[PDB]
Design a protein around this nucleic acid. Structure first.
Ligand SMILES: [Mg+2]
Lengths: 180, 133
RNA sequence: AUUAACGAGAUUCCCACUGUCCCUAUCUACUAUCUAGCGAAACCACAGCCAAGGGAACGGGCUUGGCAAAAUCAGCGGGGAA
RNA sequence: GUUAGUUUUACCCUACUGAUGAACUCGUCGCAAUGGUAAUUCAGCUUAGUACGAGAGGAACCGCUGAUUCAGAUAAUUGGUUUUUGCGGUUGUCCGACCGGGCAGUGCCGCGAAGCUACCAUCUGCUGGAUAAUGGCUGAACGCCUCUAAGUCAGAAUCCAU
RNA sequence: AUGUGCGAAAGGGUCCUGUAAGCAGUAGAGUAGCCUUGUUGUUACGAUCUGCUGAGGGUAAGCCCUCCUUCGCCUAGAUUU
RNA sequence: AAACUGCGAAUGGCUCAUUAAAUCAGUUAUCGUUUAUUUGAUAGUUACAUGGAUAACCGUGGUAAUUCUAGAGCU
RNA sequence: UCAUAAUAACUUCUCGAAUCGCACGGCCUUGCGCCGGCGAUGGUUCAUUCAAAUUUCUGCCCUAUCAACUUUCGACGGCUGGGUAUUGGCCAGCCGUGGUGACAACGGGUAACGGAGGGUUAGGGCUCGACCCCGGAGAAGGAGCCUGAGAAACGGCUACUACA
């Protein structure tokens, strides 16, 4: 079985191999969106609480919030559902989905950290990843940089740095196109 | 080993007891004992049978409730570093209070006023030459 | 020679049904059973363990062998060419 | 050629299946003469696409797992049986009505423990000796040969024991 | 034949059936009365439903436990060696 | 470039199976109804500007199998 | 009982521009002031256009070895409602007993989509019309539906049947 662990605080992701069925007997009744103590995983994981986000079956099928069953069921999907993207306005396709009860059948599980412990994870909490793009709507800059109603918000626009590939010409800057 | 729950009456079932009945349309039923099985085959309704687990739950006899919604609703976290600049650089963009920011504003508006006056002066010069033309 | 209706008349097939059967199991009442009281009949040369032999050519009895231990109760249907 | 037509008696003697029993004081624990005897056949995997054969075709011992017929037990689970007349429903009539009851040889229906019971359910069914047919060893009679004439080896679902 | 005794009741356990009698109701399809005429106006009748109620009844006659629940019985009579 | 949003995809093209007052033809009615689009008119009873998501995107996956898709971070 | 207007009210209740491109103008308290043009995209109602859906009158080939048909479970009509974009036996309740027919109803056959029209000729006719234009229906057979002004759509989806 495979586990895909993600850390939203620092924004990092890793996957770990676990082969001991005895270690994972502690779930197998937990639902989607619940709390659990990750301490019995091991000593370096003491003082951790995990949130169950979802997984993939052995065939590749995902699970869907709101269907209470350990098996998989066919349903009549519509617009707005989680595991279907229609190709034309108004389509409704019948598909098969996995229930919201964890079991020994799943092929890959996935979890997120809610509260850390004292030990550190050798590949997860030691590196931190930044965000990708700053704000661009007018109200966002004022609240973000705490300016008042009349503080010339336009000037404070976070900009990126880009280098032209032409004869190593001196780079220039790129900006977010303030709206409203 | 494993255990099952009676379909008709909800009683618990250990290995070896009871039987398993498969209906014509590929639906599997389990009965803990003869009493459940016999009643089911007569098209009786479980809702109206006084000793069933479903009947008790439907009439709400002897059970209470629980909730923890507002506990998991307090999960809020902190901000993270942008790629625009160094995280410490990001903060100091609004670390300072309103003195130095205000001082720049007077210079900026004076620059704006100077350009507008130059435009008006240039326009008057442009108007004069146009008439002279 | 045909023939509608009729038949506790003889014969063949089909649907429903079932312990007729595969293959047997269980329950109830009245006897059989034991006791107190009453209390017969058919039948009977003498009687009553077998194998072989010869003989009126299929013996309980004869010849040669096998064997063989008091008094008795409930069933059974081989024989007594019952 | 066709249709319809009464099938009597066992309690006696013996034979057989079982169950008591007088004599040497009453008991407990044992030996074993004699009598009886029991297991049977098939299928699948591997050996094997092999030995053999030009080709087409196409085996066997050991090993593993099951099954058919028969025999001896047992009832945790499944099913059958209901006078447990246990609980409930219900028809007719009778006790003035309700409650509680009688009768309809067990009124009828639903469920029904205990006991009995079903390859309709579950468990179990051993190895020593001597031999026949046949194949052999040493070896004369008959200077050679020969499994037999003296001696001797292996050996069957057979025979006798466990 | 003084006992971890025997017997008769009782309590608890385990099982079978499936929610007792009685009381109450802002339940109940409506009909007939009486009025100060009502947001349920009351008085009479009314299969059934809801609550007290997984309650009531039965339970060894070839079920289990009780020194720690109660009440009783007891070192015989006759025959024989 | 990619992607969100808007529109069309209900037009064209093919065939003659069914259908005997049914389809169809000429001629009437909507004072008995709907109509994107086109054209023409037409609406006095914090305001220097309001709020949360999501795509594209970086990076971690499953199945032999598809114009299948999961969970994490931005707008 | 039209157009339009007035009165009393009501509404999980709408609409009356938090939208985009070009130009760069005019005033006097000289303020980061006020006013100003041409377009695009939208918006309530009315009118028009492309239409659509129903609908009045008359007109079809063979057959009597098809003469009486329709109403159980609407068949002809009246009333009160429901539903549809709207009328209507279209549907739900109550009530009358009607409707078609020898001037050929009802039923059966068609190697039958209808029409504008093709072939052959004194005149009158006989026969063909799947097929380039107009109208109708269908996407293997039946049914059911989402989006939209417009679909009972099939180079859209759901289920069964038969193939694969
Ligand atoms: Mg070969």
């Amino acid at each position: 079985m495979k586990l895909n662990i993600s850390h939203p605080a620092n924004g990092s992701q890793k996957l770990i191999e676990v082969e001991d069925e005895r270690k994972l007997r502690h779930f197998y009744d937990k639902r989607m969106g619940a709390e659990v103590a990750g301490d019995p995983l091991g000593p370096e994981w003491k003082g951790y609480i995990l949130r169950i986000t979802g997984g993939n079956d052995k065939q590749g099928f995902p699970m869907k919030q709101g269907v209470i069953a350990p098996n998989r069921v066919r349903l009549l999907l519509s617009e707005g559902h989680s595991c279907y993207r229609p190709r034309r306005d108004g389509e409704r396709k019948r598909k098969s989905v996995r229930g919201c009860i964890v079991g020994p059948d799943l092929s890959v599980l996935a979890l997120s950290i809610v509260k850390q412990g004292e030990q550190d994870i050798p590949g997860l909490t030691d590196v931190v990843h930044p965000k990708r793009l700053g704000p661009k709507r007018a109200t966002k800059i004022r609240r973000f940089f705490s300016l008042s109603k009349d503080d010339d918000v336009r000037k404070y626009v976070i900009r990126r740095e880009v280098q032209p590939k032409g004869e190593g010409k001196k780079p220039y800057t790129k900006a977010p196109r303030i709206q409203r | 080993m494993r255990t099952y729950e009676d379909t008709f009456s909800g009683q618990r079932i250990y290995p070896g007891k009871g039987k398993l009945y498969v209906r014509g349309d590929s639906k599997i039923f389990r009965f803990q004992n003869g009493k459940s099985e016999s009643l089911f085959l007569q098209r009786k309704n479980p809702r109206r049978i006084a000793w069933t687990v479903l009947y008790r739950r439907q009439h709400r006899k002897g059970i209470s409730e629980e909730v923890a919604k507002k506990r998991t609703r307090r999960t809020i976290k902190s901000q993270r570093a942008i790629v625009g600049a160094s995280l410490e650089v990001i903060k100091e963009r609004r670390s300072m209070r309103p003195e130095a920011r205000n001082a720049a504003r007077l210079a900026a508006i004076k620059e704006s006023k100077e350009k507008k006056a130059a435009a008006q002066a240039a326009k008057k010069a442009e108007k004069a030459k146009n008439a002279a033309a």
